[PDB]
Amino acid sequence: QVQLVQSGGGLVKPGGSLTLSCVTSGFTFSNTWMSWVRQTPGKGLEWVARISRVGDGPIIDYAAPVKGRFIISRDDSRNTLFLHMNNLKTEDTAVYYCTADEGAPILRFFEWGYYNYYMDVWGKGTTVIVSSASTKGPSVFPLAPSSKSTSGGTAALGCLVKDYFPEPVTVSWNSGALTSGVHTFPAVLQSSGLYSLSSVVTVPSSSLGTQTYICNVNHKPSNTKVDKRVEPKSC
Amino acid sequence: DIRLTQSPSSLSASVGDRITITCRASQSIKDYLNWYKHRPGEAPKLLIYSASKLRSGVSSRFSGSGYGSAFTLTISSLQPEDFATYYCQESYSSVPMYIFGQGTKVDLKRTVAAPSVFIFPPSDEQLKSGTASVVCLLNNFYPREAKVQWKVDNALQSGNSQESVTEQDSKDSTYSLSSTLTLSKADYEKHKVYACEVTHQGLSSPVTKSFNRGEC
Amino acid sequence: KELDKWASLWNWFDITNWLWYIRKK
Numbered sequence: 001q002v003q004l005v006q007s008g009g010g011l012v013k014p015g016g017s018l019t020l021s022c023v024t025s026g027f028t029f030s031n032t033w034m035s036w037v038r039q040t041p042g043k044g045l046e047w048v049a050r051i052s053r054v055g056d057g058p059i060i061d062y063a064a065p066v067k068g069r070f071i072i073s074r075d076d077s078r079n080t081l082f083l084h085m086n087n088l089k090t091e092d093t094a095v096y097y098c099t100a101d102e103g104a105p106i107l108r109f110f111e112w113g114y115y116n117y118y119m120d121v122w123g124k125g126t127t128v129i130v131s132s133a134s135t136k137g138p139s140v141f142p143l144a145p146s147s148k149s150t151s152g153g154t155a156a157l158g159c160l161v162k163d164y165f166p167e168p169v170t171v172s173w174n175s176g177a178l179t180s181g182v183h184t185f186p187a188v189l190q191s192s193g194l195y196s197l198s199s200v201v202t203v204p205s206s207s208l209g210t211q212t213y214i215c216n217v218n219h220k221p222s223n224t225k226v227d228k229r230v231e232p233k234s235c
Numbered sequence: 236d237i238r239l240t241q242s243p244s245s246l247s248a249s250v251g252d253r254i255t256i257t258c259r260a261s262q263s264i265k266d267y268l269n270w271y272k273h274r275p276g277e278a279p280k281l282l283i284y285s286a287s288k289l290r291s292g293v294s295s296r297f298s299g300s301g302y303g304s305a306f307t308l309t310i311s312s313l314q315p316e317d318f319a320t321y322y323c324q325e326s327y328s329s330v331p332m333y334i335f336g337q338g339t340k341v342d343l344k345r346t347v348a349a350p351s352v353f354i355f356p357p358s359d360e361q362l363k364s365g366t367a368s369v370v371c372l373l374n375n376f377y378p379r380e381a382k383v384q385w386k387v388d389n390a391l392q393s394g395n396s397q398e399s400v401t402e403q404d405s406k407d408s409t410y411s412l413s414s415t416l417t418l419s420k421a422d423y424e425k426h427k428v429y430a431c432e433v434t435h436q437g438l439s440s441p442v443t444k445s446f447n448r449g450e451c
Numbered sequence: 452k453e454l455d456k457w458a459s460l461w462n463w464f465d466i467t468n469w470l471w472y473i474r475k476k
Contacts, residue, residue, distance in 0.1 A: 004278075031460040035333075037279075045271075045279070045322055047333035056464060061331040097279065103463040104285045105470060113471025115463065116285045117326040117333065118269040122278040141358045143370060148446050149353035156353040156372055160415075162361070183374070185399040185413045198399065198413040200372055202351075235356060235451035 002026035002121055004098045009126030011166055016088050016130075022081040022098035022123060029079040030054070033101040035119060036072060036083050038094040046094075048072075049083070050101065050117075065091070085128070093130045093189070098123035131165065131193030137224030138164035140217045143200060146235035150205050157230050158200030159215035163192070164222070171199040172216045208232050237262055237328050241321075241336040245379060247344035252313040256339045258323035260304040267327035270299055270308050273338075274319040275402075282321075283308065310341075318343060342379060345408045349437030350376035354444045356451050357423065367423035371431035371444070373412040375404070378436060385416045386430045386445075392416055423448070 008020040020036075035050035049072040052059040060072060071084040081098060099122050103115040143149075143158035150156070161169055171184050178201060187197035199215055209232065217226045238261040248254050258268065266286035273279040281290050283299035286306060298309045308321060323336040350373035357367040373381055379400070385392035396416040403410060414431070430445035 028460065031462050033464070039273075044338050045273075045324075045335040047331075047335070050331065052464065053460075053462070055459075063332075102284075103467065104288070105463055105466045107470075109474065112474040113467055115326075115467045116267045116269070117331070118281060118284045118324065119271070119279075120281055120290075122280065124278045139361070139364070141361045141368070143355040143372075144358070146355075146451070148444060148451070149355060149372070151351045151353075154351070156351075156374065158355070158370075158372070160358075160361075160368060160370060162368065183401055183411045183413075185401060185411070188397045188399050188415075190397065190417075196368075196397075196415065198370055198372075198415070200374075200411075200413070202374060233356075233451075235446050 002100070004100065004121065004123035006096075006098050006123045006126040009096065009128050011129050011131065012088055013132055014089060014130055017084070017086045018088060018128065019085065020083040020096055020098075020126060020128075024079045024081070024100065027100065029074075030076040033103070033117075034072075034074060034081045035099045035101050036081075037097040037099055037119065037122070039097070039125075040094040048096070051081070088128075088130050090130045092128060095125040095127055097125045129166065129189070131189070133165040133193035135222050136163065136165045136194065137219050137222035138162060138169060138217060138226070140215065140226045140228040142228060142230040143198070144230060144233035144235075145208060146233050148235045153205050154202050155205040155208055156200055156202050157213055158198055159217065159228055159230060160196070160198055161187075161217055162196040163190075163194045164196070164219055165194050166221055167195060169195075169197065169217060169219045171197075173199075173201055174212070174214055175216060178213070237264070237325065237332060237334055239323055239325055239334050239336040241323060241339050243339060244337060245340040245342060247342040247378060248313055249344045250313055250315055252344075254310050254313060254341065256308040256321055256323075258301075258306045258308070258336055260306075260325065262327075263303045264325050264327035266302055267325055268299075268301070268306050269324045269326070270297075271322045271324065272317065272319050273322065279322075313341075317341070340379070343403060343408045345377045347437045348375060348377040348409055350374060350381060350412070350433060350435055352431065352433050352442050352444045354429075354431050354446060356429070356446055356448070362420050362423070365420045367418045367420055369416045369418075369429050369431075371414045371416075371433075373433060373435075375407060375409040375411060376435060376437065377409045379403075379410050380436070381410075381412055382434045383412070383414045384432045385414070386428075386432060387416075387418075388426045388428055
């Protein structure tokens with residue numbers, strides 16, 4: 001059974017270098033073409049590079065935005081595909097997929113020699129994050145409820161976990177007792193290289209003034225743990 | 236210069252439905268087209284290669300057809316296991332470009348639900364730090380598409396805010412959106428009205444929620 | 452084990468190059 005074990009992805013500063021690896025099994029690695037494909041969260045797929053069998057040259061092709069910075073290579077004796085990434089830039093932040101490719105020969109006479117190149121098997125991917133930041137715990141600010149966050153008998157409140165690095169961070173409400181109506185949004189990576197996310201919960205407006213609301217934030221990478229009470233505000 | 240445009244970029248449907256994703260091409264590429272599926276929690280998967288050849292292992296429900304500059308991907312009897320995003324990929328460019336379409340998100344069909352728009356001013360805790368973040372919340376809406384514009388004293392803000400959208404809720408099958416406008420303390424203190432304008436299919440006209448700094 | 456020193460592999464890329472060598476004759 002075929003599998004593509006990817007490794008080597010993580011954090012790196014702008015201008016740094018990183019090497020991704022993809023150890024394969026379940027098929028003849030030395031007889032198969034390989035490619036790298038990356039996806040930036042929020043955008044689509046982008047082919048990065050491809051490499052053929054060693055005996056074919058090898059034939060190597062790069063996408064324009066990476067030509068001159070990325071190097072694709074392979075080690076048949078260890079069934080490993082590599083991607084040496086140099087002079088990394090914030091635009092390189094993405095999930096990088098390992099792929100085993102195949103070619104469908106064209107059988108039309110005037111097209112003999114041409115082929116359709118497609119990605120046959122994809123790896124689960126590996127994340128590469130380009131940021132200048134270092135480990136930093138979040139600041140947890142309140143999203144105070146008010147008339148400007150109420151729709152009839154329903155009010156909204158939350159917590160703003162801002163300026164932390166790296167992922168992840170956990171958020172709960174009232175020590176896990178409040179779970180209905182909660183929405184913890186995916187964190188966003190800011191232009192500063194730090195993360196920020198929001199956690200909100202809609203509650204009956206009549207419960208304001210009686211029910212205490214606390215968001216429990218934990219950022220293990222920085223050993224920072226905070227419990228933040230959120231109270232109504234006039235607006 | 237070879238481009239690929241998929242249509243629709245996002246459309247809804249229910250289990251046991253017939254859908255037809257279309258992949259338009261700027262140039263004739265014969266049958267040098269392939270289709271992939273991608274779910275955010277797993278690796279992408281090849282479905283159709285060379286226009287209309289089914290990869291071994293994929294169920295017979297997926298079908299592809301087309302030749303030249305237009306193609307299609309049909310999924311008879313929509314199954315819950317395949318609510319995901321689909322991409323078309325071309326391999327006709329002499330230069331190995333391997334362009335992918337922008338994608339097509341297959342959503343769970345639901346009655347139109349307008350977003351509940353909420354706005355939160357910055358906290359004194361953050362102002363003491365020298366920064367001011369205003370967040371606009373759009374709660375439980377459908378369909379996915381929704382636009383948010385920030386205006387500070389009627390001045391449109393461009394490039395100083397960020398959005399974040401949740402996955403379709405497992406219970407009510409709606410979406411939620413959070414947008415954060417961040418300014419410096421000084422810039423925040425020299426303006427009065429802060430507004431979040433929302434447009435969405437369920438809103439007869441754009442909705443704007445705002446507040447006055449001096450009064451809040 | 453590789454009992455045959457002259458054992459090598461063949462894939463789709465060999466097909467394409469051959470069909471091309473024939474079109475050019």
